[PDB]
């Protein structure tokens, strides 16, 4: 598994044409989330292809 290429799986809304963002914050969990931890819906935004 070549764990070098990733891709944003979660975000908030759609993006405008040719709009690039790199932020890798921890996605929300409805309530105040589990910043930097796991839980109900604590989903890292990036996912590797492998």
């Amino acid at each position: 598994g070549n764990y070098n290429y990733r891709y944003r799986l979660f975000r908030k809304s759609n993006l405008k044409p040719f709009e690039r963002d790199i932020s890798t914050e921890i996605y929300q969990a409805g309530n105040k989330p589990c910043n930097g931890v796991a839980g109900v819906n604590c989903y890292f935004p990036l996912q590797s292809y492998g």
Binding site: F10, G30, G39, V40, N41
Partner: protein, 50 residues
């Protein structure tokens, strides 16, 4: 029921709210394939088996 005797059921014809889950438990294992958990409550389905 046991592993080799899972309790199949059908649940249709109902106004389904997928947010009663989060009040249950720490939800050790919760991952969805083919559909994001955040945008589930809006999307619609033919027949949902559990």
């Amino acid at each position: 029921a046991s592993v080799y005797a899972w309790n199949r059921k059908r649940i249709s014809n109902c106004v389904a709210d997928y947010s009663v889950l989060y009040n249950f438990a720490p939800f050790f294992a919760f991952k969805c394939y083919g559909v994001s958990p955040t945008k589930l409550n809006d999307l619609c389905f033919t027949n949902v088996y559990a």
